[PDB]
Amino acid sequence: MVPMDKTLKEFGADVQWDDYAQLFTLIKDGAYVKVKPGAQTAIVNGQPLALQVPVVMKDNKAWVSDTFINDVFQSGLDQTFQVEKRPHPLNALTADEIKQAVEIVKASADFKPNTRFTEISLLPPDKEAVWAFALENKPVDQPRKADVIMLDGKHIIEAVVDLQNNKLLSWQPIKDAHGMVLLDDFASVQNIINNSEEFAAAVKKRGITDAKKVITTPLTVGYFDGKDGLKQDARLLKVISYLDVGDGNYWAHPIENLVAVVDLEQKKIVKIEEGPVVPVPMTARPFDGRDRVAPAVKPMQIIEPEGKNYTITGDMIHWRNWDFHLSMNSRVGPMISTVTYNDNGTKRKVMYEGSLGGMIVPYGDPDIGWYFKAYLDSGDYGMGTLTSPIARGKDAPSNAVLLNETIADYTGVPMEIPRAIAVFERYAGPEYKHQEMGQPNVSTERRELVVRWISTVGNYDYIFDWIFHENGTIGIDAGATGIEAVKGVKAKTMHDETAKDDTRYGTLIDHNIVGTTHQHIYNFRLDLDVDGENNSLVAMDPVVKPNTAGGPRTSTMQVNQYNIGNEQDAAQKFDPGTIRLLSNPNKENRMGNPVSYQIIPYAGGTHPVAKGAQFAPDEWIYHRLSFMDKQLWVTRYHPGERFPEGKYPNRSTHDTGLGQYSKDNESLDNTDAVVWMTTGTTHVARAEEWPIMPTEWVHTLLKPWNFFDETPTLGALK
Amino acid sequence: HMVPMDKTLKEFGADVQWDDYAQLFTLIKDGAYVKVKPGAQTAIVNGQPLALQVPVVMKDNKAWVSDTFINDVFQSGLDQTFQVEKRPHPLNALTADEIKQAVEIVKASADFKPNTRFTEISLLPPDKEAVWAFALENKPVDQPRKADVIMLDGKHIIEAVVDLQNNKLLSWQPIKDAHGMVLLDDFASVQNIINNSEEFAAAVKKRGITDAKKVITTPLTVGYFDGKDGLKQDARLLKVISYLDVGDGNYWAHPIENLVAVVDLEQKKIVKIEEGPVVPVPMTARPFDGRDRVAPAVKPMQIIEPEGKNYTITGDMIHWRNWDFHLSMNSRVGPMISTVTYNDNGTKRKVMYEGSLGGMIVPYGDPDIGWYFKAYLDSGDYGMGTLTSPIARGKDAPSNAVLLNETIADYTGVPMEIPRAIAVFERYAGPEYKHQEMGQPNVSTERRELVVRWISTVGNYDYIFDWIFHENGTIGIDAGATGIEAVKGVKAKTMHDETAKDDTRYGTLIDHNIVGTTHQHIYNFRLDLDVDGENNSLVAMDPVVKPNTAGGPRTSTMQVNQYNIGNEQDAAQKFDPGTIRLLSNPNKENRMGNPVSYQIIPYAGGTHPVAKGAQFAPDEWIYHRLSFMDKQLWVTRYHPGERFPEGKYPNRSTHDTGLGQYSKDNESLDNTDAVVWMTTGTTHVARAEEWPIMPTEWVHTLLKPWNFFDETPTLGALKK
Ligand SMILES: [Ca+2]
Ligand SMILES: [Ca+2]
Ligand SMILES: [Ca+2]
Ligand SMILES: [Ca+2]
Ligand SMILES: [Cu+2]
Ligand SMILES: [Cu+2]
């Protein structure tokens, strides 16, 4: 027997005692338990459970069998999770597979000592086979394969391994390609700066007493055709510094105009750039509440006493008419695959694969410490790897289920991310309503299933929500919070001499602190298969036309409909006033209209909107990352094209992503198309966002358009 | 003294939950969360013990409570959601007694004519200054309570002002050329008139309708076409569109296309019958109430607050966290949010004197006889407050909501209580903020939003309005649209039929012989914001890409050209979501020397295509009469008499008496009491998924504090 409280809260379960009813309510994920002290039985998700040993109260402390948790929580009454007997071909690599894949490449005569692993992911069977498995239960009859991308010092090599037959299929060095930033790179940078007398000297000038309190940040340097004075061959990283004053927020104490260039191979500082001396903002700015007292609040719980409406079999999620596969990737994070909508007993294809394409956060300041900031969070830092475990009840509602996910770290060792993904159902207002006058009301509530993932890179915290509506609609929201990247300035208020110049590229959000303006650009790769593989891109532009039918009206509301036949034409600006559809020219609904899905790149946002890239077309960042200037893109399906910014975005000399994927202007008529949505924000700071940023959101949407023959939620006919 | 518990409570409107295992009842009703065990002499209300002389009784599997149970428990006091107002708020809506008093005064008036109807009976706005002084300094107003009595003498509008404090008639003013809004009896008249019309009955028989009694009419405003519609500006008219009742509870799905009747409400007769091509009435049963559907089993989900709410409702005043505001009801525009302040560490700062729906419009794009004239001004012409739809507990609002009742006067001057008129509820809205510093302990807080929801149904349309108070100072205003679509009867069954192309030129074929005619939903919000004081100024911040002149590899930089918007004509503009518009207080600054401000966002997204402006050529009349349709942002100087974007009397109006008029004089908006008007809407191109019933579609607007505070608003109290 063990103390119930310790044991349970140690298990991650929530414990509630109701003295009035002499009842304990235990909650953890899909399990909702009720147990009375001394009772021979308990209740699990509405179901009675016989107990070997009743709960025991001693000294008014609850005690339970040391087998309690297993007997009750893993009893079987909680059906949230189901056993997967036949593994989905898209299941991410297991811990064993990761270790097996590493062995295979390490057994090769070519494997160099100290080699690192930028990414170890599943090399998936072909699309056709996967769909056949999901739709016809046909086995892929294939061997598990893995892509093993390594970083030999600074050299990239791509290998492919065959896990079943445990053999190396290929070993290909990738010329000119720079590797992404790995964990250890962060330590080297701090160490190299720590051992540099020069740097300590530069730091000395700028008023810094203890060079040991200096906190560094490793930043990608981009590419400027040589204008930045950096050689293209060398694996580089720029270093921005802050002074640790003990407030837990070194971001609030920038050391302006001091930039160091570090060569990770030579393990040394190869260039120190010094600008005018700006006193370090010293005032403590904690964001963790150490200096605060939250106001008392009454409790709020969202409960599901009988369990969840969804079931999770392996990674396969089932919920109402929805069925999809959820996996994890070290680079882009969560991947939603083989998405189908069960249309009255028939599973219809909606999306083969959906995930984050890639993202970028570019700044608008030309000064030495800023002109180069263009963070490619997923491509250069690895968002899946940097996943931030969900804070139960806070980062997600109390009725959510938290999933653990496994990936490989940069040394090839399995890595399990606790509470990596949040799954939860939520009330979203009335689904539909009609109060006919003098008649009984008609109302149904809307239910949405949310798959939430949070990744934190440096000072930024990003939230991604994949929202499944019961009615067939899919929403994709991106929230942004964290700590702002600030610039040290001499003005304390807007009444100071330098205030005018100090705020030229950003707002004065605190004394001597300017939140430099920038943008948040998110790109989503959505391999939509609208009720099938072969689709077409159709445009519907609402227009005002002169009236030719007679009567008092001079004009009418009509629609200019037309096909967009190629990739170049498909790459365009999005007007929320227009309609863009991905149709299946081979299938129609009951009214003769081709079944389709409405693509909405911009469905709102809480920060000013990014019309495009706040960059002149001659800027290198602009050249390299085309996906930034267009909100909508459609390319022919190709398993090798998955990143808007290109596979190897670090110090890239040109566009290897969407710019390249659409480059050949291929046909998009009745063929397998891939939709790419670019949505972003223009961030001009406020005091309300300092020291910590209130979460800002952007919304995207995918609506069924004549995909169904009527209101999808009415239900089956009697 | 005993009653069957389950029945009594259900009837009372309380949610009843029985837990066989715990032998416990859980009762929920608004701010009250109750726990009670059979036979127990004690019950729990919001975590507090309540003694019961007569326990709940379990008789033969049946629960029983005393005839006094509901009162003793629910109205015990342990539920502190509602408190008693000591000193009456000057903005409190007229009481049932005041309504009846105002009706007596004008009825005792020399000129009062029998059969005079009442379009609107509302409190006459006390001096805005006196009202703030009361809310901020608790200084009594001290001016007699007045009421505006707008009546319809047949088709004539008269404006009476009564002094309730002294029981005096202050003024009786006939309003020339003005038309009155559509009243409830007008609906009954239209049907009777069509029912008694020999010719109309004949018109329907030739269109396939065997039983004239099965014909259902709808009363639509005709607008104004400079006589082009062949209708005299003098008469009080309404056009009539009909549907055939086939018994599926959804007559909207059975249009009698190309048949329009003009009804002169004063003469009580059809003064004109416009007939077009005969189109066979769509007959297939298309019920939307589920009568023909299988009810799928879903697992229960409840949002609970066991110890009560975080907000308190004293009279009509609502207190929640740092927010304080007054909530009342108006027969025309519905809910009104007044004297809105934000408690800043002990100091209540002004945010908004009053906000509410300004007005709205739903214009169609079909030139045909049964459509060309459809340009609905729902609130002005139909009165949305009056048409408020009682909230369906748990469905129209989350289960943790508190439902308020609201009282207004009906068109005959009699007090009218709207059950569940407004919904108040707190909700979880993801993390307020978060930062997971690597290798460090996580920092996360949840976001809480207080939502004020109101639903109004006008004919086939169902509108939902949410006033969202973010704990961090932000205020959101969302509009949701649902209900049944106004459809056009057409010959084509599928897009393959010969007439399909013509049948769909103005809308999508959403069902056999049914076309969801294209139209737009344009909402306008009147927001009298007092950003930390009365005197404010309109400022523009345009994020621009400026060439780099500071040196380095960069060719360009991201800068902002800021500038003030001096007057009304200039403030009336389109809104570019890529830009920033602020209502600042030039007389007050935050800790960094920046003018305390609020960011105005007329466009923050939507689930339907967005309306770029009115889908009308500029030579159209509906476009002329109403200018609020084209601009998303407007700023005018405060005027207690300017409240409607479309004008006070929009029925058959011949010119712009709304926002076109209010800004017409191009007055200065510099350091003065400003009023912000936000326009947003959708362009609705139908699809099968929206028939027979439309899934709720939403549009969002936002008001964000901009340097109004000195730091993250929700950081918490400082121990330093
Ligand atoms: Ca291509
Ligand atoms: Ca596809
Ligand atoms: Ca004016
Ligand atoms: Ca004002
Ligand atoms: Cu930002
Ligand atoms: Cu509509």
From Swiss-Prot, chain B:
Q: Where does Cu cation bind?
A: H519, H521, H684
Please list every transmembrane segment annotated in the UniProt record, as residue ranges: none
Q: Where does Mn(2+) bind?
A: D528, D530, D673
What pathway does this protein act in? Answer: Amino-acid degradation; L-phenylalanine degradation; phenylacetate from L-phenylalanine: step 2/3
What is stated about the way this protein's activity is regulated?
Inhibited by 2-hydrazinopyridine.
| UniProt keywords, alphabetically | Calcium, Copper, Manganese, Metal-binding, Oxidoreductase, Periplasm, Signal, TPQ
User: Is Calcium a UniProt keyword of this protein?
Assistant: yes
The catalytic activity of this protein is classed by the Enzyme Commission as: 1.4.3.21
UniProt PTM comment: Topaquinone (TPQ) is generated by copper-dependent autoxidation of a specific tyrosyl residue.
Q: Where does Ca(2+) 2 bind?
A: E568, Y662, D665, E667, A674
- Gene Ontology molecular function: any one: quinone binding
GO BP of this protein: amine metabolic process; L-phenylalanine catabolic process; phenylethylamine catabolic process
Which residues catalyse the reaction? D378, Y461
The GO cellular component terms are: periplasmic space
Task: Provide the protein's localization.
Answer: Periplasm
Stored PANTHER family:
AMINE OXIDASE (PTHR10638:SF41), COPPER AMINE OXIDASE (PTHR10638)
In Swiss-Prot or TrEMBL terms, this protein is called Primary amine oxidase
Source organism of the structure? Escherichia coli (strain K12)
- Name the encoding gene, please: tynA
